[PDB]
A paper describes a structure:
Brown algae utilize phlorotannin as their chemical defense against the predator Aplysia kurodai, which uses β-glucosidase (akuBGL) to digest the laminarin in algae into glucose. Moreover, A. kurodai employs Eisenia hydrolysis-enhancing protein (EHEP) as an offense to protect akuBGL activity from phlorotannin inhibition by precipitating phlorotannin. To underpin the molecular mechanism of this digestive–defensive–offensive system, we determined the structures of the apo and tannic acid (TNA, a phlorotannin analog) bound forms of EHEP, as well as the apo akuBGL. Combining docking analysis, we propose the mechanisms by which phlorotannin inhibits akuBGL by occupying the substrate-binding pocket, and EHEP protects akuBGL against this inhibition by binding with phlorotannin to free the akuBGL pocket.
Numbering used by the authors: 26 to 977
The structure:
Amino acid sequence: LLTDKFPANFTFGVSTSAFPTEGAWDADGKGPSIWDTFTSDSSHVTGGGDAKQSADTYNHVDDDVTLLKDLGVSSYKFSISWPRIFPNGTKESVNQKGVNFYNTLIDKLLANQITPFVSLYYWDLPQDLQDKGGWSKDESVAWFGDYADFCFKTFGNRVKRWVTIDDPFSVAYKGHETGEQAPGVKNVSVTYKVGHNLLLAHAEAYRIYKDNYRTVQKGEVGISLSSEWYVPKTTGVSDVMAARRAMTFRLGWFLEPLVKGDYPLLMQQRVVAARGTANGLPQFSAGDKLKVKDSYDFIGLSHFTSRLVSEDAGVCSGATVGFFCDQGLKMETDLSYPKLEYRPEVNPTSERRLMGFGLLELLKHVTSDYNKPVIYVTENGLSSCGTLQDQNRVEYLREYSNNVLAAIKAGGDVRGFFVWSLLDGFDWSLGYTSKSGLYYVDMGRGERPRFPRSSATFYKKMIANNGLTDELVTYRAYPADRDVFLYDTFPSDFMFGVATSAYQIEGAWNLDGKGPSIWDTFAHNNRLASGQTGDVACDSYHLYMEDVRMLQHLGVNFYRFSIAWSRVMADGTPATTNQAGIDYYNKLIDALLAAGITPVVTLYHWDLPQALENDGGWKNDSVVDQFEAYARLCFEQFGDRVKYWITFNEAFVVSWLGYGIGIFAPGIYDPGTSPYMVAHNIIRSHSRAYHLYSNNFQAKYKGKVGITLDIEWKEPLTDSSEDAAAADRAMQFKLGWFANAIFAGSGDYPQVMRQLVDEKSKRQGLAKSRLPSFTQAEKNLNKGAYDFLALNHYTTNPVNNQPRPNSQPNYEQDQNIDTRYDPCWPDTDASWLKVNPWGIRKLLRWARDHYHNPEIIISESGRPDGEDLTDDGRIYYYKYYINELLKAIKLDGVRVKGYTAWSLMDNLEWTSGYYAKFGLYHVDFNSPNRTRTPRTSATFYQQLIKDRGFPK
Ligand SMILES: *[C@@H]1O[C@H](CO[C@@H]2O[C@@H](C)[C@@H](O)[C@@H](O)[C@@H]2O)[C@@H](O[C@@H]2O[C@H](CO)[C@@H](O[C@@H]3O[C@H](CO)[C@@H](O)[C@H](O)[C@@H]3O)[C@H](O)[C@H]2NC(C)=O)[C@H](O[C@@H]2O[C@@H](C)[C@@H](O)[C@@H](O)[C@@H]2O)[C@H]1NC(C)=O
Ligand SMILES: *[C@@H]1O[C@H](CO)[C@@H](O[C@@H]2O[C@H](CO)[C@@H](O[C@@H]3O[C@H](CO)[C@@H](O)[C@H](O)[C@@H]3O)[C@H](O)[C@H]2NC(C)=O)[C@H](O[C@@H]2O[C@@H](C)[C@@H](O)[C@@H](O)[C@@H]2O)[C@H]1NC(C)=O
Ligand SMILES: *[C@@H]1O[C@H](CO)[C@@H](O)[C@H](O[C@@H]2O[C@@H](C)[C@@H](O)[C@@H](O)[C@@H]2O)[C@H]1NC(C)=O
């Protein structure tokens, strides 16, 4: 990479085109384009969807010009929509409201010192003109002339850089031969006639400008052409001339008519050789050659890729005519150059390659063979799945703009570089499956908010320094080791397990004297899917012996399950101790130990006995004593054989879902106060349960007590310091809510929660703050009240700052945050779970740094899949999350002592019923015997334990 400065009056720009970004497809009298009609057929668009709104730039001029001021670009390339100016294509349809929109944009651009670089035709052909033949017709030269003449006299007093036609190759070939772009015509005999008329339309536009508008307006008029760079597959003369021939058919098809005055002679000969003399390229009239030759002030170039070309006379057969059968060559991807996908294993055959040298050679070729024209790179950029930490785009922007510097030093007269693109949009036939903006656009929000990707920060800094600096040479958007797969084994101490839950597997909700749960009541109130209940579930009350055999087949070291409070105490009181309940858990513990499997017992999970919810449940404050007496009964009966206790599972869910929005049991909706009241007692219940164990049981039993908290990793949406503070704030409010008082050291809530809920409570007119206050004695009982930390981790979220100065009392509104999902993270059967393996690694270091380097167990990890036995999604998930877990141990030193896979078998997924299959075993819930069937994932997990990591 060169650290030289760009020339003095070099233009750093950025590009959009009307249809991918404007939206408002029929607002204010705009007529339909061929792309409106084309995209109305889902089969034409990858991933479906339409551009009826897309990025909605028609309604964001003020916001988008502010983004242009933030980058510091000198100029802005955009497109005028023909059907928005002339709804039916003719000058009689002139729509003043469409004229007003572009005037607003041009005026606002110049008020902020940004040069307009205006394109007249970026494929937006009005549907009415297509209905009468489109570009195949000789009338299209006149249609375009009247339309160009209008924009010249209407905007030309301010617009000084014009592009007649953008990428005629795609308009002709992709739009009329293969049909992949609008208007979807598939006719090999139309393409050369369309390119012919595009060149004639551009010439008529250039002629109109030179004679009627140039003397007064003093602007420039050019055309923009697209070209890949073609490197020969071998050094043989055959392939070197096949590569040069592909450059001729793709770029010289239009460049040679405008420079030399005719189609390239090589191109003329090849088509007549493959099609017949009656079917050659169109002939230019003597007057046509006069109008076309030298009809440019600059040449625009859009470049993206380099491909390998080799001679292939039999690339087609049986006289199958066509644009690429006339050339007699094949194109391949150069897999020798870095792949630009989200992760190393994504799409091995990818064409997105880091080949900046191709742009250097393209520019030098255009300078050498076409008499050194003025060049603007009007479009150059990388297509992504959409991530905002776009190291791939940063590398692309860094390398490719650096090869522009090399062309200028090699004599290339390149005066501008325009990045494709400014925002995300509807990338033609790729639809929304392809993102390219320096700014991400959230297409799930009506206002379509814009957010800078890391490439926006890079481009801003490079323009500020007029080239690269040492900081920009080595700049990275994320650490270089993030996606590297680590082949290694786990430490000797490391345990593998799987987990279940009492209400989700056991059944027998009222057999043998068991009292009812708040989840028995939730289910019997038809609050679960299809009125499905956990009345039988997997019948683990009767079939626990099957569970042990499955655990033996997996080879797990430990098995984490939960005790049902209502099964050992009918009403949650020792007065209702159910010896039958004691015996059931004694049988499960003994069968696990006889099989050499370590039992791990969760005390609570989520099934409070209804008798205690009647007295106020977790809001009642004596629940601290009630939970302590329940913990005592468990420590006495089972403490002799159970050596790892977990007090609570996902106290966040019990607090916010159960007592906040009331979607889980007990179903109380009070999002302002009760979640904090319940979490307060949970912290106080866990602390008293821990001290009861260390004071009265740890000496003789030598066990460890922990707590399990669920948490998504919280990644900043943007590299800004306000978004980094927002991400940490989202961590504190969900994980720190409980972990801070137990693990951080102060025995108290995170300072951010106390500051924020107090201040908002005061504005809302509340006598006391909605977040309770610990007594100094209570804080001291919280301090160090643990032996290990346990984390449930499934997914992550990008977070951004979002002040809410008028928010109502609400645990989520108190946080001043907003959440999204990275578009690159794959989906699962659950709308809230996205696959992001490195989230568990960043989460583990966060817990390590904030909680005094504790012993950590991952108590839950997994995803839903389909019902068939081949769950490749589950395997992909475990393969890479466990590898990221291994990285947190070996590479990061985090004291991770165990890993728990959710779940052992299909079970009742709370409100989602049995429709969400989470298990390594399939469970037939229509069988009375509830047969369990191992999936592919069970073998993969069993094999991974044997290997103790990842070998080779
Ligand atoms: C292209 O649009 C022009 C503007 O018309 C407006 O947009 C079109 C898409 C349509 O929605 C119209 O309703 C809009 O007004 C067309 O010109 C217009 O043509 C119409 C007739 O088609 C004409 O209406 C007539 O006006 C006379 C009085 O002058 C009245 O007695 C009639 O009853 C009827 O109302 C408009 O006045 C006229 N406007 C302008 C500015 O020209 C254009 O149509 C073509 O050109 C006009 C001059 C006539 O010769 C039409 O026969 C002819 O088709 C549209 N062109 C095409 C190819 O569709
Ligand atoms: C938390 O939940 C406990 C357990 O239910 C509540 O204690 C109970 O309060 C009931 C009243 O709400 C008591 O019932 C009354 O008992 C007396 C006899 O003592 C009868 O004469 C009378 O008619 C009622 O039946 C119940 O005895 C009591 N149970 C226990 C074990 O204490 C508790 O309520 C609160 O605390 C108790 C100690 C009393 O002071 C109650 O008046 C008070 O409301 C619940 N606490 C909260 C904050 O909801
Ligand atoms: C492909 O384009 C050529 C050149 O413009 C047309 O002449 C072809 O049309 C042919 O002639 C018409 C009258 C009709 O018979 C059509 O079926 C013929 O192929 C055109 N071909 C197609 C299929 O549209």
